[PDB]
A and B are shown apart, each in its own frame.
Chain A
Amino acid sequence: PTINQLVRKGREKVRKKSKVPALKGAPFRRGVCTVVRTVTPKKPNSALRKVAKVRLTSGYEVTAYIPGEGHNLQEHSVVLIRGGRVKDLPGVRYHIVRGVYDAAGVKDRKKSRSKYGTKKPKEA
């Protein structure tokens, strides 16, 4: 690409598509469950993952994943959306901030609690 060609053309500044339009470029978005059910995973695996269709305050309506063991999410559960896909669940590219608004923390969780919203199990 001769010096001249660069003088006339120039190089192509790369641009990046936000892998997550939670919008407002915010880290979280207050949503409202509309539907909650189990979706079958992709090709190699096989389970019954728990997911929830949510109506965001950003106008959009996306589906999200609910990590943990069982839940208290229903047709109207308000909830906070986190952001981070799930390479195994088609289009599901947002997580539910387990332990906020109407999403209770994982019951009987000891290991990691920063996630799962479950607090210090005072067993003394």
Chain B
Amino acid sequence: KGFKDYGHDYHPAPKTENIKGLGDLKPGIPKTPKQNGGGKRKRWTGDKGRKIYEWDSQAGELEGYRASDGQHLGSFDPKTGNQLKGPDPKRNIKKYL
């Protein structure tokens, strides 16, 4: 459903193996800066593995860009494997990979 915060204003990357949204989840780098995030989100190219996930901390959500073009493909719940959006026409991640 929604967020679950306490004193923290950002969602932490839940590292894997809990994320049963997609298959084969496969971990990855820390390349693409935060929305002023102190750094670089957690990525999990994953099923296919020609697919990438970077994490929305404010949002609670991880968002998928393609392996190839590097075009936002969705946002999905780590919990389920049901998406949350549309593909956003307006961002590219492959300049960070």
Prevailing SS type, chain A contact patch: loop
Q: From residue A66, how far is it (CB to closest CB) to chain B in Å?
A: 14
- Assess whether A37 is in contact with B6, with CB atoms less than 8 Å apart: yes
A16-24, A43-51, A78-86, A106-114: which lies at the B interface? A43-51
- Number of cross-chain contacts by CB at 8 Å: 22
In the docked arrangement, what's the CA distance between A12 and B29, Å?
Answer: 57
Prevailing SS type, chain B contact patch: loop
Whether a CB of chain A sits under 8 angstroms from the CB of B81 is no
Report which of A38, A39, A40, A43 forms a contact with B36, defined as CB distance below 8 A.
A43
Contacts of B10 in A (CB 8 A): 40, 46
Contacts of B39 in A (CB 8 A): 46
Show 22 A/B contacts (Cβ-Cβ < 8 Å), sorted by A: A37-B6, A37-B7, A38-B6, A38-B7, A38-B8, A39-B7, A39-B8, A40-B7, A40-B8, A40-B9, A40-B10, A43-B36, A43-B38, A44-B38, A45-B38, A46-B10, A46-B37, A46-B38, A46-B39, A48-B8, A48-B12, A51-B7
Binding site for B on A (CB under 8 A): 37-40, 43-46, 48, 51
